[PDB]
Ligand binder design. Structure first.
Ligand SMILES: [Mg+2]
Length: 164
């Protein structure tokens, strides 16, 4: 057996997209005539390349997905998920300021999944620290999410659940 997590949780800024939604862009956003997503200042908004397949892959492996962001730009973060047609991949979204221990406690309540069976991807060590205290397997990422990072992450979770 290779233990698959019962819930995968993703940070947003520098995890699914290369910027801070409360700093580098100016919400609201909208799809342009050329199919791109744009903000009030005409910026081309893009996700990390492989994000759609990362989320689709989890869906294929039967792993439920949730979002956990501390951004104050709540409606902006939510709109990007919609515009990028990623809504279909998430079962829950915890997007609001605060230590992510809160986001995870609520995810635990809504999903019934034990913290030990969750895998979490985030680029900030402070979030890795806070959430790791709950027993969640935390994957500290760099250069955003990609299929390779997903694979290594699930591998790390499987190894943890195997006494490694
Ligand atoms: Mg981040």
């Amino acid at each position: 057996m290779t233990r698959l997590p019962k819930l995968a949780v993703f940070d947003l800024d520098y995890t699914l997209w290369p910027f801070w939604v409360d700093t580098h862009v100016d919400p609201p956003f909208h799809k342009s005539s050329d199919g791109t997503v744009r903000d009030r200042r005409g910026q081309n908004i893009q996700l990390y390349p492989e994000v759609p397949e990362v989320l689709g892959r989890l869906q294929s492996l039967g792993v439920p997905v949730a979002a956990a962001s501390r951004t104050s730009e709540i409606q902006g973060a939510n709109q990007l998920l919609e515009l990028f047609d990623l809504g279909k991949y998430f079962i829950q979204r915890e997007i609001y300021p605060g230590s992510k221990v809160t986001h995870f406690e609520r995810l635990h309540h809504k999903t019934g999944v034990p913290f030990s069976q969750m895998v979490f991807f985030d680029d900030e060590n402070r979030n890795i620290i806070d959430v790791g205290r709950l027993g969640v397997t935390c994957i500290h990422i760099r250069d955003g999410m990609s299929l390779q990072t997903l694979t290594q992450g699930l591998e790390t979770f499987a190894k943890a659940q195997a006494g490694l």
